Amino acid sequence: LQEMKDIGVQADANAEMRARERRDRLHEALSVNRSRVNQLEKQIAFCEA
Amino acid sequence: LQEMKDIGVQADANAEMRARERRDRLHEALSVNRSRVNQLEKQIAFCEA
Amino acid sequence: SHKQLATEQYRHVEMARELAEQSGASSDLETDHQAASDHLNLVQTAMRQ
Amino acid sequence: SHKQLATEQYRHVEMARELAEQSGASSDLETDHQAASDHLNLVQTAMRQ
Secondary structure, eight states: OOHHHHHHHOOOOHHHHHHHHHHHHHHHHHHHHHHHHHHHHHHHHHHOO | OHHHHHTOOOOOOHHHHHHHHHHHHHHHHHHHHHHHHHHHHHHHHHHHH | HHHHHHHHHHHHHHHHHHHHHHHHHHHHHHHHHHHHHHHEEEEEEEHOO | OOHHHHHHHHHHHHHHHHHHHHHHHHHHHHHHHHHHHHHHHHHHHHHOO
């Protein structure tokens, strides 16, 4: 129980799956945004050349 | 100890640092590979146009 | 043709600038998402204990 | 002129037929490195235990 206090995270199951969903969709959204930025940059290089 | 062996991880600090460093290096190398793919794709587009 | 070239140069500058902004954004998000996954693991451990 | 450009196109086709494979391999490696980081986290947890 002292270890539970040390970690301090409230860590509820509802909160658990919710958090994992949030962060995973966040990862994938990040990756997609990075891809889109790269695509646009490539377009810009095309135009310049 | 039974829990240790059920997870089965050797849990030696030295191996821990070594494994983590190796995986981080692989992360960075893979990021380099993705970047390289990006630049070469840029070149493909330039040449084709 | 000179005027069109100058205009395209302007447009290119604008797009390149905004895309640099988006690249910085994506990197910051990457850091955020690393932290996110760490949090997920913490929560799972709290569940089990 | 006619004979130059076709050959150049074919060379570029080859280069793209390398880039796409590097890209797919890179994505798979990304998943693998995520799993590796998971193992790192397991070792981290095992330290305290």
